Amino acid sequence: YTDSYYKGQTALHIAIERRNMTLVTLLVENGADVQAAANGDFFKGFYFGELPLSLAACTNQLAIVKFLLQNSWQPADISARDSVGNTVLHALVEVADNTVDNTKFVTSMYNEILILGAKLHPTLKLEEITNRKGLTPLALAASSGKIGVLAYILQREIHEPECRHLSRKFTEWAYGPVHSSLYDLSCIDTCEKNSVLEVIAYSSSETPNRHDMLLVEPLNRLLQDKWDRFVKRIFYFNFFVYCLYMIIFTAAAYYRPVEGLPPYKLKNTVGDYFRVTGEILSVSGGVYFFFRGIQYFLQRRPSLKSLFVDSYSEILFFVQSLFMLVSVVLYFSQRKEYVASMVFSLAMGWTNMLYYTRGFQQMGIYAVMIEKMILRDLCRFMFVYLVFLFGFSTAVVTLIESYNSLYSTCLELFKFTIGMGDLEFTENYDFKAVFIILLLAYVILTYILLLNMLIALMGETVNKIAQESKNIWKLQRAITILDTEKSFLKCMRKAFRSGKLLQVGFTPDGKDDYRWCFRVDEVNWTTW
Amino acid sequence: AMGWTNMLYYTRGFQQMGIYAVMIEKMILRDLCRFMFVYLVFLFGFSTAVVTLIESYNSLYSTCLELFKFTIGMGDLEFTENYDFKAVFIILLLAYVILTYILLLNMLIALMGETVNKIAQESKNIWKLQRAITILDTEKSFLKCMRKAFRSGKLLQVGFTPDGKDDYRWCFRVDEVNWTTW
Amino acid sequence: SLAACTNQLAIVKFLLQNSWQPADISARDSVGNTVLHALVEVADNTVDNTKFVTSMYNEILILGAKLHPTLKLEEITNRKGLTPLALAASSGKIGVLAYILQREIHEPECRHLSRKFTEWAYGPVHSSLYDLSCIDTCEKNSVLEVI
Amino acid sequence: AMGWTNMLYYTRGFQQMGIYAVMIEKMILRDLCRFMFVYLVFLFGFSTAVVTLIESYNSLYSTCLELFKFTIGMGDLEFTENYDFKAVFIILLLAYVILTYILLLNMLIALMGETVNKIAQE
Ligand SMILES: NN1C(=O)C(=O)N=NC1=S
Ligand SMILES: NN1C(=O)C(=O)N=NC1=S
Ligand SMILES: NN1C(=O)C(=O)N=NC1=S
Question: Which residues does the annotation say bind Na(+) 1 (chain D)?
Answer without folding.
Answer: 73
